[PDB]
Amino acid sequence: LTYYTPEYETKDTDILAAFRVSPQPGVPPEEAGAAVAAESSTGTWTTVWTDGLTSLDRYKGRCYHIEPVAGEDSQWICYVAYPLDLFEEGSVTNMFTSIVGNVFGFKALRALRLEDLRIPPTYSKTFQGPPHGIQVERDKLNKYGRPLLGCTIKPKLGLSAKNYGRACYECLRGGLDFTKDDENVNSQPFMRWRDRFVFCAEAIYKSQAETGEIKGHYLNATAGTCEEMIKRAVFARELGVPIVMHDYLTGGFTANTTLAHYCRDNGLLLHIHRAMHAVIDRQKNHGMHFRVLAKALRMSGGDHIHSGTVVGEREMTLGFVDLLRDDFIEKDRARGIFFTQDWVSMPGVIPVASGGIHVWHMPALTEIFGDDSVLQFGGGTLGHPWGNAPGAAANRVALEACVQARNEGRDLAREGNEIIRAACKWSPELAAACEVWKA
Amino acid sequence: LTYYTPEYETKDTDILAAFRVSPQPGVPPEEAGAAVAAESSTGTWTTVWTDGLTSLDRYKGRCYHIEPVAGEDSQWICYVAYPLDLFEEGSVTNMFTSIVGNVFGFKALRALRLEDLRIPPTYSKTFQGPPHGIQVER
Amino acid sequence: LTYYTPEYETKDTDILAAFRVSPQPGVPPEEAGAAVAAESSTGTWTTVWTDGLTSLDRYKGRCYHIEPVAGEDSQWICYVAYPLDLFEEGSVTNMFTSIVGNVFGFKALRALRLEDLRIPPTYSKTFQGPPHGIQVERDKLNKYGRPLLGCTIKPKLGLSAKNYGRACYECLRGGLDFTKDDENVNSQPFMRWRDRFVFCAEAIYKSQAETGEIKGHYLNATAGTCEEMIKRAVFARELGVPIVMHDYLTGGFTANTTLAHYCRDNGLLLHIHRAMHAVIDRQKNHGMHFRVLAKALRMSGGDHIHSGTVVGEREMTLGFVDLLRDDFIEKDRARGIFFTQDWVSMPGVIPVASGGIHVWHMPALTEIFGDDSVLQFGGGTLGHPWGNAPGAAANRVALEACVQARNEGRDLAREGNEIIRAACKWSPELAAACEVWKA
Amino acid sequence: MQVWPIEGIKKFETLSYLPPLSTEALLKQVDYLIRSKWVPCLEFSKVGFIFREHNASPGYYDGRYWTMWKLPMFGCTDATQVINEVEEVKKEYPDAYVRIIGFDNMRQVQCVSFIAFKPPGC
Amino acid sequence: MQVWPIEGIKKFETLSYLPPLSTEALLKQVDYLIRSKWVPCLEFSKVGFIFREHNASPGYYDGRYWTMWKLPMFGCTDATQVINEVEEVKKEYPDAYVRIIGFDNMRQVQCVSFIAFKPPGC
Ligand SMILES: [Mg+2]
Ligand SMILES: [Mg+2]
């Protein structure tokens, strides 16, 4: 119908969306695609006289292209173009409201997934973006030429604030750049946030003074209200520490954007955790792919973002890691990049890999993500038989051995086990880590 | 395993969750439910000495009931109990982070849906709730 | 009558009260109990038409149980249950207004005492509670495995602020953890509060630098108005000192709760003094037992609370000290615990023993209260023949000798005098203290 | 009349006002931990005391944390094992302070701390 | 069980957890810069580590900058030239730390830093 316009030339100011559409039986792709377009824009069930007070064509979403999905006889990618004027400047909230607010409940569809968005420069330039971004962060921390290393403190709940800070000091002093608050750790009966912030600050400053290297702890500012979130960031600011944390999907985009602005204004790095993402991004037929949530974070603002474990599909991960880090990313269907994306010098976000990784993963992780990444342990440090500081040292040594080998021209994919084995000869900490975890 | 506790009596202060669990082929329902409980609470992939600085039993999610779903095959409803102390007072953000923050991505599940939550009075009384509500509005 | 409901099953959300009721001659316990219930709830002298606009049964206090008091032929304990909806969240003020606001003047009663309250978790969870509580305080001060020690400066009034701070430095440097402002010391002509705060801060920091141990002075913030109380806490905050003080009954619960919140937000410990309590809590037949005032303080908020001298009845003290410190306290009539009390992880309050105690009391005090207590001298330090620093050292030595002996498995109740005598052999300060005070 | 000294007697909290504990006396304090079902652990440091270098807001101090020696001795039933490790620290770090701490896995906190060795010369 | 040392092993970021790099190993790291089309440069300092003396607001530290030795070696195609300059610094400043850094004129930033010489005695 009138919302399927296959001859439309997209404008350089349009927001474009690629939807994976699964229509009900009997519903051709073209009116499914047209329904997505009309339902996520100007479509309404009966005619109305106020339409004649404007030019509706100027606000129509249009489905301008449809292609089949490989391996499916009832799934299509439908491309939809939305005019720039639909969107409130600087608001990820309004961008999602306008595009995914209504159409996922349409009855003629069995399922619907948003795969990708083309964010035009005219729109992305209305956002702050990362408080600092990759390059500024490396300069502030004086850290170059290797992935950054972190550890999440466990048990997440259980410890007193003091015992919690003790574990942080021991991790940091052994060679990790950062320690982190579990996503669940906000403020709770046996560890109130302000107590935790004081002891973690003592730990950060003790470990930095001991090692000579800059240290941080991702202090979780996630809270029930905006007022509490900002109170937490304000105290971190008072303590002079370098980095805070936010759970951006459960706290939400309005709060995240507020926090990103506060962090820009006060020189704080912002570590973003993606709790609840798999509620939305797991199933191939319905929801939103994480690369959409990743672009939205880059716009709303964060300096780090959790990006997986890669220990999903390699090519898809590599795809949205480029979308997070790079200035210009060309369309590349093999890597899940449905649109060419130009960020016109908005800083990039450092991807963070976490979840069940130990020293034997270091070659693969270094090879996959390269230097601009955070490798985040949590079990792989606190599970070392000699304790946290040696566990940290084992991970730092393994990483630096991989970086040295890579820089020398050695292939990490083929020689990683040998690289690690050679380092075990002079690092008893690494040797010990290598016999507990096996491969 | 240790996170499936079918004889557990729920506390009046517990937050209860009902999950619709779709395990991967060959993953028994009890393991799936235990995993949903362990992965939405304390489950850590290696042992850490700091567990000895506390009593983790106190903070464990527990799967205390499992039942099959009529209309389907390979779908179970699993009930999980979470202790009150896990949750930040007055924060829906923390409640969701804690319960649905991580478990939906677990490899051994094909799919997971949260169907209901028992919000105990001891937790809901820490929330303002509606600015006015039905009666005041009228 | 209709307010005596002996078959009522209490709800887990009810506030329960145990009243010691002394009716006028001719008044049976049942209508005395029913009068307490109706008079502390919905009872009114004539019928009113507005009652038909609601369901009064839902707001009735009910007397649900009556028992005789041992040794009395005209005194009963009457148990009353109040619905949760009667009470404003987070307000000790409203809890007392609602329960003890009116009924103590009822003419059919000769006397009335409130003995205990069952504070349900649904209600206590609406309160902050202690700004820090026992465990956090020990972690902040880095003090473990012994009672804390303090001294109240005397004369309360007389000294210049400077001479006052001099006495504080000498006490602290000799081994006390704290010094304290007399309850009467707020701001007065010859010692204005801000002057006192400056000199006590100089003293705290001199003694801490000399000994290597963390020191504090309970700076009294009690004042005529909320604005002045907070001005005083704000300056303590500026000075970076660890602890302030409040007289919670004479300042009052609205002010105390305000101060407890300020202390949570700013990392200050809060020492609570109970001036005027015996006006209310002394007489067995009328008033409120201190365990009621103690629960109310734990809810409103404090990190320490004066809890007696135990040098009253042992069992009653042990009773409300558990109610102050523990998470779960089972009903125990021998210890004055009328209701099982579950605090669902609200932190505990450190009890403070004071009033005429010297080195010879140390074994008994250590045995009665155990480690989580403050032993507060005031005469027993400033009365040492060699002055304050030796008096402090004598008390610190006596305490540590008792703790060492106890940990070794020795019985403090039987061997205390020998333990103290053995310490006198190597501590001339203790020997000197032991000849002035005798037993 | 004796004057309390102003130097040379900096302190380490609980039991540090007693004469330095003999091996026998130290063993009894470690046995108290074991009997209480608390977990012993050693800490050590080249700096003995609290200070304020990086911040001075209420409740913030530096020097409260020392460094952990190895790991907490979970399941230790023999006090002599603890005292032996004290000698190992002394061997590797001759001029370090050493203290014994104790973890209560039931109230979930650190609950003990006392000095085991002070370098003479300090 | 070995205890991670608390003294004598202050660090210099990337590659400083490895044994000190031999001349052969250093040459290979400089060759990596050249192959990457990055510009090598030497820095040096009498103070090895980060500190906070003049300000302590978030992201402010002192001691991040060291002093530049001469100029970046634009168009360097021979790693041995870089290693030779390291010996020149060592000659003029026997008790200075020396590190090799690298400039990426394409992403417009410093992108490498690693220690080349630490004075023994430190
Ligand atoms: Mg986590
Ligand atoms: Mg007094």
UniProtKB/Swiss-Prot annotation, chains A, C:
Localization per record: Plastid, Chloroplast
PROSITE patterns hit by this protein: RUBISCO_LARGE
Catalytic residue positions: 154 (proton acceptor), 273 (proton acceptor)
Predominant location: plastid
PTM entry text: The disulfide bond which can form between Cys-226 in the large chain dimeric partners within the hexadecamer appears to be associated with oxidative stress and protein turnover.
Residues that hold substrate according to the record: 102, 152, 156, 274, 306, 354
Cofactor binding description: Binds 1 Mg(2+) ion per subunit.
Enzyme class: lyase
Biological processes, Gene Ontology terms: photorespiration; reductive pentose-phosphate cycle
Record: residues binding Mg(2+): 180, 182-183
Molecular function GO labels: magnesium ion binding; monooxygenase activity; ribulose-bisphosphate carboxylase activity
Subunit-level organization: Heterohexadecamer of 8 large chains and 8 small chains; disulfide-linked. The disulfide link is formed within the large subunit homodimers.
Summary of the function given for this chain in its UniProt record: RuBisCO catalyzes two reactions: the carboxylation of D-ribulose 1,5-bisphosphate, the primary event in carbon dioxide fixation, as well as the oxidative fragmentation of the pentose substrate in the photorespiration process. Both reactions occur simultaneously and in competition at the same active site.
Family: Belongs to the RuBisCO large chain family. Type I subfamily.
Protein name: Ribulose bisphosphate carboxylase large chain
Annotated source species: Triticum aestivum
